[PDB]
Each structure stands twice: as C-alpha cells, then as structure tokens.
Amino acid sequence: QSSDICIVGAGISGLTCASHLLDSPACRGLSLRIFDMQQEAGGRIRSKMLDGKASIELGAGRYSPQLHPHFQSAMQHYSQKSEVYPFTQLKFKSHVQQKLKRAMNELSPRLKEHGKESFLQFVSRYQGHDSAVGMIRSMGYDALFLPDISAEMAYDIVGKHPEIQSVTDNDANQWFAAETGFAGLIQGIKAKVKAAGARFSLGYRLLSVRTDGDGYLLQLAGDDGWKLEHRTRHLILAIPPSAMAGLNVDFPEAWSGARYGSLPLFKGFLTYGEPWWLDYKLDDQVLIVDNPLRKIYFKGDKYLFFYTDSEMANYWRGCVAEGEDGYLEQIRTHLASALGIVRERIPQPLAHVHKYWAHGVEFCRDDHPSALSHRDSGIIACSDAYTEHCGWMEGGLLSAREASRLLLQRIAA
Amino acid sequence: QSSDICIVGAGISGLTCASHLLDSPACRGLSLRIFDMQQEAGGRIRSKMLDGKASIELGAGRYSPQLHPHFQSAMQHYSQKSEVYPFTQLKFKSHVQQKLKRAMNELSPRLKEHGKESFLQFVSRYQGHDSAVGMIRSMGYDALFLPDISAEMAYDIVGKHPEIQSVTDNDANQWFAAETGFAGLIQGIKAKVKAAGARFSLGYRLLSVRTDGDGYLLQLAGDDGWKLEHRTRHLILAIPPSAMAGLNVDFPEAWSGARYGSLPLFKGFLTYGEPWWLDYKLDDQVLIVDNPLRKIYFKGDKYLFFYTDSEMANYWRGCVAEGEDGYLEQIRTHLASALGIVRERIPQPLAHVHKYWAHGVEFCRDDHPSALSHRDSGIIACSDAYTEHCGWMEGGLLSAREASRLLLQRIAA
Numbered sequence: 097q098s099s100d101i102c103i104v105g106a107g108i109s110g111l112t113c114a115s116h117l118l119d120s121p122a123c124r125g126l127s128l129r130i131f132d133m134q135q136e137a138g139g140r141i142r143s144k145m146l147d148g149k150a151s152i153e154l155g156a157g158r159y160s161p162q163l164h165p166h167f168q169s170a171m172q173h174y175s176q177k178s179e180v181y182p183f184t185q186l187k188f189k190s191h192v193q194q195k196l197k198r199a200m201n202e203l204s205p206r207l208k209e210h211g212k213e214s215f216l217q218f219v220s221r222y223q224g225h226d227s228a229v230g231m232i233r234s235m236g237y238d239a240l241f242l243p244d245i246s247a248e249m250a251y252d253i254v255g256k257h258p259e260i261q262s263v264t265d266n267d268a269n270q271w272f273a274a275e276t277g278f279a280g281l282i283q284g285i286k287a288k289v290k291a292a293g294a295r296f297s298l299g300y301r302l303l304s305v306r307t308d309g310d311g312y313l314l315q316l317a318g319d320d321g322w323k324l325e326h327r328t329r330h331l332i333l334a335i336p337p338s339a340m341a342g343l344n345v346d347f348p349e350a351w352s353g354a355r356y357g358s359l360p361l362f363k364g365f366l367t368y369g370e371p372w373w374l375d376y377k378l379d380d381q382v383l384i385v386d387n388p389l390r391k392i393y394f395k396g397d398k399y400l401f402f403y404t405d406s407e408m409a410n411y412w413r414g415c416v417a418e419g420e421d422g423y424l425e426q427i428r429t430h431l432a433s434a435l436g437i438v439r440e441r442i443p444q445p446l447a448h449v450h451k452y453w454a455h456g457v458e459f460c461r462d463d464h465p466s467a468l469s470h471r472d473s474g475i476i477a478c479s480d481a482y483t484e485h486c487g488w489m490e491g492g493l494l495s496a497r498e499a500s501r502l503l504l505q506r507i508a509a
Numbered sequence: 510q511s512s513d514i515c516i517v518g519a520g521i522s523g524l525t526c527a528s529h530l531l532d533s534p535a536c537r538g539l540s541l542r543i544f545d546m547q548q549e550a551g552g553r554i555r556s557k558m559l560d561g562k563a564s565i566e567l568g569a570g571r572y573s574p575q576l577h578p579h580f581q582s583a584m585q586h587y588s589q590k591s592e593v594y595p596f597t598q599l600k601f602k603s604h605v606q607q608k609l610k611r612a613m614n615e616l617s618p619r620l621k622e623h624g625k626e627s628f629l630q631f632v633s634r635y636q637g638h639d640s641a642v643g644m645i646r647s648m649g650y651d652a653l654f655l656p657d658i659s660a661e662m663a664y665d666i667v668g669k670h671p672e673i674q675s676v677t678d679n680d681a682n683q684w685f686a687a688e689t690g691f692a693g694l695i696q697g698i699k700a701k702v703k704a705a706g707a708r709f710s711l712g713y714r715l716l717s718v719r720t721d722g723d724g725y726l727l728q729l730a731g732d733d734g735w736k737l738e739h740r741t742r743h744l745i746l747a748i749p750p751s752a753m754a755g756l757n758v759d760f761p762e763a764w765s766g767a768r769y770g771s772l773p774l775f776k777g778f779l780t781y782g783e784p785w786w787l788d789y790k791l792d793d794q795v796l797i798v799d800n801p802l803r804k805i806y807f808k809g810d811k812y813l814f815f816y817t818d819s820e821m822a823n824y825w826r827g828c829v830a831e832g833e834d835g836y837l838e839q840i841r842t843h844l845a846s847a848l849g850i851v852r853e854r855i856p857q858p859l860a861h862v863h864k865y866w867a868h869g870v871e872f873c874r875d876d877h878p879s880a881l882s883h884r885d886s887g888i889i890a891c892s893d894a895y896t897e898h899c900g901w902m903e904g905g906l907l908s909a910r911e912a913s914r915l916l917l918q919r920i921a922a
C-alpha cells in the first residue's frame with residue numbers, strides 16, 4: 097500500500113484539500129489516497145432522512161453568504177441548492193433577552209479597558225452577578241459562561257449566531273441551509289476527487305505515523321481490527337486537534353505554540369403524526385429557554401428539534417444512556433414547561449433521532465496560521481480549529497487552501 | 510445507573526445467561542442490565558440479506574441435532590424453523606481427499622501409542638511429510654497444520670465438520686441451517702429476556718472493572734465516546750477470552766490454569782445474474798481446493814460463497830483492503846482455477862458481501878470447567894471457549910447453563 101499523497105480525514109477539510117491538489121498541474125501523475133475511520137465521508141457534516149420523510153442535519157446546519165463566502169461559492173460550484181434558514185430572529189422576546197441587548201450597548205464604552213475579562217464578569221458590571229446570569233442564560237449557548245471567553249470574544253460570538261445576532265444588531269447576515277442536506281456537497285466533492293483519480297479507503301483509523309526516508313509509514317486499523325500499513329511521500333492530517341492528540345506526532349507542541357480545547361454538542365429531532373405546534377403559531381420559530389432543552393426549533397410543519405452545548409449536551413447524553421423511554425418523557429416535560437402548555441397537550445413522537453458530539457466544537461485556546469506543519473517531519477495539519485472561523489465549515493475551507501499550498505511547496509522543493 | 514445483576518456480552522451466551530437467570534424464582538425482584546459494545550445483539554451470529562434477496566450467514570452457519578442438542582432444543586423453543594444444510598459430502602473428491610480417508614483408517618491402530626504427536630507428524634507416517642501436507646491441505650481447514658493440534662484432536666475435528674465428516678465415516682450426523690437466519694433465534698431470546706424485565710444498553714464497551722464493597726464498578730464507553738459508570742452486585746462477562754485479555758482482570762492467570770488462543774475467519778458471498786454453476790452440476794455442492802478460496806460452496810441457484818481460516822482469512826482481508834475491484838478480480842481468478850475452466854467463463858457478480866472475524870474461533874490451548882470464576886472477586890466468565898464445544902454455538906449454551914448456576918449460587922449465599 098503506497099501513494100504519492102495521502103490525506104487522513106474525509107470531512108470537508110480533507111476532501112477540499114484533495115480537490116485543490118488534484119486541480120494543480122503539479123500533481124499530474126501523482127497518486128492520492130484518502131483514509132477515514134468512518135464508513136462514510138463528511139465528518140461533522142451528517143445529513144439524515146428523519147422517518148424517511150424530512151432531511152435533517154445532525155451536525156453542521158446553516159451558513160451565511162456574508163460571513164462564509166467560500167462555502168457559498170462551493171455550494172454554487174457543485175450545484176447544491178440553498179434555502180432560507182428561518183431561525184434568525186427571536187419572535188417571543190423575553191425581558192432578560194431585551195435587557196442583555198441594552199446592557200451590551202450601554203457597556204460597550206467599557207470594552208477598551210475591561211474587555212479582556214470574562215463575558216460573565218463584564219456583563220456583571222451592568223446590574224450585578226445575578227442579573228448577568230439571567231441575561232447570559234437567555235442566549236441559549238452555555239459556552240458563554242466560560243471564564244476563558246472574554247467580553248470582546250463574546251460580543252463577536254453573539255453577532256455571528258443566527259438566533260441571537262440581533263442582540264448586537266447584526267441582522268444583515270442572511271442564513272441559508274441546504275435544500276437536500278449538506279451531505280450533498282460532501283458527495284459532490286467526493287465524486288469530483290474520485291473522478292480525478294483519488295482512491296478512498298473508508299473505515300480505517302490512523303493509529304500512528306513515522307518518517308520513512310523521504311516519506312512516511314502509516315499504521316491504520318480497520319473497524320474490524322485489520323491492521324494496515326500505508327507508505328506515502330506527502331501527508332495531510334485533515335482531522336481536528338482532539339484527533340491529532342490521539343496520534344504519536346507530539347501535537348500540539350511540535351506544531352504550534354498554542355493549546356486547543358473543545359466542547360460537546362447535542363441535537364435531538366422529533367417528528368409527530370400531526371404538526372401540533374401550528375396551533376400555537378410556532379412554525380419556523382426558535383424559543384430560547386431556562387430549561388434543559390435550551391434552544392427549541394420548529395421547522396415549518398415538518399419536525400422540531402433542540403440544540404445544546406457543554407453541560408446540557410452532557411445532560412441529554414446521560415439521559416439517553418438511562419434509556420429511550422425516560423429520554424422521550426423528559427423532552428415531553430420540558431416542551432410543556434417551555435411552551436406553557438399542558439403536558440397532555442404535547443403528543444408523543446412517531447420517530448426521533450439524536451446525536452451527541454463529544455468534541456462538537458474545537459478551537460484554539462489562545463496569532464495562528466490557517467494550517468500547521470510539524471517542525472521536524474513536514475506533515476501538514478488541516479482543521480477549522482486553526483482559523484478565525486473555528487466551529488464553522490468556512491474554517492475548514494480556509495484551512496484547506498493553506499494546507500494545499502503547503503503540500504504543493506513540499507512537492508516542488 | 511445500577512443493577513442487581515449485570516451481563517456484559519449479548520451473543521448467544523450472554524442472552525442465554527439472562528434467560529436462565531430470569532427463569533429462576535430466585536431472581537424475582539432483581540434488576541438485570543445487559544451491555545454490548547455493538548449496536549445489535551448476536552456477536553458472532555450475524556445474518557444478513559444478500560442483495561435483499563436471500564438470507565446469508567456471515568458468522569455461524571450450521572448445526573447438527575446429533576452433536577448440538579441444546580441448540581436444536583432452543584430452535585424449537587423459539588419456533589425457529591430449520592432447513593437442511595446441504596454441504597455434507599464431497600461430490601467431486603480429489604485423489605488426495607480419497608487418500609486421506611485411506612491413510613487415517615490405516616493409521617488408526619497407531620493412535621494409542623502415537624496419537625499425541627501433531628496431526629501433521631502422525632499422517633506423515635503413511636507416505637512421508639510431502640504426501641501428508643497434500644492430504645491434510647485437502648480438508649480445507651488450515652488449522653489442521655498447527656503443531657499443537659494432535660492426531661487425536663484432528664480425528665475428532667474432521668469427524669465434526671460437515672464438509673469432511675465422511676473422511677472418518679461420520680455420515681450419520683445431519684446438518685441444519687436456519688430458514689430465516691440464526692439472527693431470528695437471537696431476537697427470540699432477546700424479546701423473551703426484555704419481556705421479563707431485562708434492560709439493554711447496546712453500543713457500550715466495557716473498559717475496566719473493580720470491586721466495590723459487595724459489588725462491582727464498571728467503566729464503559731459508548732461508541733460516540735460517552736463515558737459511563739455502572740454499579741452492580743453480580744456480574745457475568747459473557748465475552749470470549751480475547752476480550753477478557755483486553756480488560757484489567759488479569760485474564761487468564763486469575764481465572765484458570767490454562768491459556769487460550771484464536772484464529773481469524775473470513776467468509777465472502779457473491780450473487781450473479783444467472784446460476785452459472787448449474788452447468789457443472791455444482792448446485793448444493795462444496796469444493797475443497799489448494800487455492801486461497803479453500804472451501805467453495807454453491808447454494809442451490811441462489812449464490813455462492815467461500816470460507817477460510819488462519820493465513821487465508823488474512824489473505825482475503827488484505828485483498829479487501831487493497832480495493833474492491835482487485836478483490837473481486839482475485840475471486841474470479843481463483844474460481845476459474847478451482848473449477849478448471851477459463852477465467853472469461855466466470856461472470857462478474859451483481860452483489861457481494863464479506864466479513865473478516867479477527868478472532869473468529871477461540872479455544873483453550875491446553876479438566877476445564879464450562880464457566881469460570883475469578884478466584885478473588887467472584888466475577889463469572891461465560892464462553893464457548895471454556896467447553897468441549899469451543900467454536901460452536903452449542904458451547905455457548907453449555908457455558909451459559911453453568912454460569913447461570915454459578916451466579917444463582919452467589920445470589921443464594
């Protein structure tokens with residue numbers, strides 16, 4: 097098993113690296129092998145058909161052409177149709193959400209001096225700690241309570257998420273979803289690189305790598321235990337920092353002066369025999385609540401879902417572990433209390449799907465190149481986490497641009 | 510959470526343990542939790558639809574009512590219909606297969622004095638080493654070449670496998686398969702155990718266990734990374750010796766005076782537009798050949814498959830890893846040579862499925878109890894590998910019987 101070029105990771109980053117390399121005249125005649133530990137490409141892009149009826153996004157779900165121009169361009173390039181993503185305003189504005197908008201405006205002159213303190217400590221200047229907790233909780237993203245998220249970071253974060261962007265008057269961002277699922281873009285890239293001669297080995301997990309003369313020897317394991325050795329001349333690891341850390345490549349110290357973190361994410365989707373929420377004018381609305389569901393979305397008349405992070409993602413995953421019936425009963429209870437509705441008036445679902453992402457969002461904990469190189473071995477690393485767009489598909493696209501240029505440089509050396 | 514009784518492993522052994530325990534009046538009122546690292550029960554019983562048409566067995570495939578009475582009784586108990594397994598004679602015997610029958614008969618008076626030497630060394634007494642290799646290879650089970658398989662053991666092995674049992678005049682054994690797949694029996698046991706109150710947590714891998722007072726604390730990991738702790742008062746590990754060795758319970762030293770081994774297995778199934786093998790009168794026949802396919806089976810007019818162990822299982826898994834196209838081409842090459850027909854006359858398949866089992870058969874290497882106990886902790890271990898029926902579902906049923914009695918004794922103490 098040998099190749100000129102090897103890419104480990106068949107998410108949007110790795111597949112886009114492959115696209116850029118195969119487009120280069122400098123890679124004519126070179127063989128390209130792509131590994132992924134999963135049996136399908138896409139990584140944290142994961143589209144499914146809910147009850148075989150509606151397409152849902154278990155992973156990445158939305159993008160903005162204003163914020164994410166490379167993604168918009170890729171959707172157009174592969175003829176993937178977009179649709180409006182409807183969850184961009186908060187119709188049922190609560191007092192504490194209105195208050196946070198006022199507080200963030202009133203406090204903004206203090207960002208120059210005090211903007212490096214935590215968002216929680218900063219917002220506490222408005223009316224005290226307790227009022228700040230109530231206000232921040234109403235944004236629905238529990239990461240905003242982290243001590244390491246500064247006020248200046250949080251102001252940026254709030255303005256780039258569609259549900260809460262009005263809180264910093266960032267309403268000019270439009271938000272789109274995929275008409276057929278972002279998996280269609282993944283499959284478009286995969287089919288393009290395969291037509292250009294890439295060979296795919298899905299279901300193989302890279303365990304270790306070592307330099308082999310001017311190349312590398314990779315040790316992988318199939319998901320049935322089969323041990324595989326692969327030799328390559330040039331290597332991109334298009335996997336996130338948590339995955340790099342599981343390898344034997346001295347990540348992160350040999351690659352940058354930075355530390356990386358991650359947070360868990362959870363999504364749950366439910367579909368019902370009737371669109372019972374139409375009676376309450378909830379179609380295409382999102383509710384943000386002081387309640388373990390946190391963010392509750394009603395998609396037209398098709399389905400509902402909720403989206404949580406950090407401790408509440410872990411709460412829902414623990415519930416799942418205790419059993420399906422208790423999990424569905426807990427959703428029913430929290431929906432009733434969020435909607436001010438009789439628990440009996442919330443029906444039971446016909447079908448549901450959920451997904452827990454242990455490292456759903458990854459990020460640098462601290463300047464930083466968009467792709468990295470191992471100081472000794474020349475292996476290249478590619479991930480949204482190395483960019484200003486960490487946690488967005490746009491970031492993978494940007495990292496892929498840099499990673500492909502670094503690999504071309506090595507090839508031409 | 511917690512349980513009175515916990516079983517790790519939901520193959521036929523673990524499920525049968527649960528059934529026996531839940532049938533006991535001594536377990537009234539007790540809670541029972543069952544973990545398995547896979548998302549479905551069954552273990553090495555794995556039934557699948559080939560091209561959605563016919564049911565095939567990627568794992569265990571046949572049993573004999575004469576050799577395996579508890580399995581026949583379980584099929585009847587759960588109303589699972591059996592059908593004749595056709596591959597019980599060699600219609601197209603080679604000369605070397607005929608010669609091995611003569612050799613084993615002519616040498617049998619030497620078994621008393623010399624039966625503990627290797628099968629290879631013993632058969633070499635007939636016409637020398639080279640003739641013995643030719644004869645033994647023609648049985649199609651490469652394990653027969655191991656130095657640790659004695660002549661006494663091999664005579665027993667040959668007489669209990671359907672394709673070659675005529676070599677030792679064991680034609681009285683009938684052989685059956687499941688009309689709908691042995692997965693139906695697994696699901697029967699599962700439904701019975703679930704009705705009786707057992708709770709299933711599938712997709713959780715046991716990582717480690719330690720004693721905790723009068724019970725145990727289990728560390729498990731979901732296949733999405735979720736880490737889970739479980740407390741129980743009584744524990745059966747219904748997993749094979751290879752899986753025991755991966756835990757932290759000092760297997761095998763703390764459990765038995767014996768050592769355990771394993772061999773890989775591989776099955777490949779192919780379906781075609783036409784039953785082309787009918788022209789050679791091969792329907793419902795098996796050929797055993799000196800080529801990597803080893804044992805080639807033609808099932809009516811429905812499909813063909815091959816079944817290999819040891820180095821040839823690894824040969825095929827390596828082929829799979831190099832690519833689907835090269836794997837199918839290799840099958841076509843070896844099929845042509847085995848049938849003595851030209852390669853072009855072998856059509857290309859419509860659909861195919863395969864399965865590599867890294868530890869497909871597990872066995873004791875060396876008066877062995879049918880279930881084991883940890884000398885200190887009281888944990889119980891259950892597996893076909895601890896019985897005189899290692900490698901057969903019957904052995905799981907026998908080990909389950911003993912392991913359930915060992916647990917009831919612990920409960921009633």
Ligand SMILES: Cc1cc2c(cc1C)N(C[C@H](O)[C@H](O)[C@H](O)COP(=O)(O)OP(=O)(O)OC[C@H]1O[C@@H](n3cnc4c(N)ncnc43)[C@H](O)[C@@H]1O)c1[nH]c(=O)[nH]c(=O)c1N2
Nearest residue numbers: 105107108109133139140155156157158301302339488489
């Ligand atoms: C719940 C949720 C919600 C969102 C998002 C994610 C999640 C989980 N995101 C972020 C988006 O999903 C993310 O930025 C990109 O998909 C990451 O692409 P990569 O290819 O860099 O990594 P990604 O993690 O997708 O791919 C890495 C690949 O490497 C493989 N791998 C890892 N280790 C390996 C090994 N050792 N051997 C072999 N293979 C290995 C993995 O199997 C995986 O396929 C998002 N973005 C956005 O734009 N809009 C949004 O709405 C959201 N929302």
Ligand SMILES: Cc1cc2c(cc1C)N(C[C@H](O)[C@H](O)[C@H](O)COP(=O)(O)OP(=O)(O)OC[C@H]1O[C@@H](n3cnc4c(N)ncnc43)[C@H](O)[C@@H]1O)c1[nH]c(=O)[nH]c(=O)c1N2
Nearest residue numbers: 518520521522545546552553569570571714715752901902
């Ligand atoms: C290719 C092939 C062909 C045959 C056979 C097997 C194979 C692979 N067999 C043998 C038969 O399949 C075997 O004897 C029984 O299925 C074994 O049943 P057990 O429940 O003991 O183990 P089995 O291995 O089935 O179950 C063990 C369970 O433990 C789980 N597990 C392991 N470690 C774990 C951990 N750490 N945490 C959680 N879960 C864990 C596994 O996922 C699995 O579900 C057979 N027999 C026969 O009668 N007739 C035949 O024709 C053949 N032929």
Ligand SMILES: [Cl-]
Nearest residue numbers: 135136137286
């Ligand atoms: Cl795919």
Ligand SMILES: [Cl-]
Nearest residue numbers: 453454455456
């Ligand atoms: Cl993740």
Ligand SMILES: [Cl-]
Nearest residue numbers: 602603604605
């Ligand atoms: Cl012959």
Ligand SMILES: [Cl-]
Nearest residue numbers: 866867868869
């Ligand atoms: Cl196995």
Ligand SMILES: [Mg+2]
Nearest residue numbers: 105107110334
């Ligand atoms: Mg990738």
Ligand SMILES: [Mg+2]
Nearest residue numbers: 518520523747
């Ligand atoms: Mg079992």
Ligand SMILES: [Mg+2]
Nearest residue numbers: 610613614676
């Ligand atoms: Mg004989």
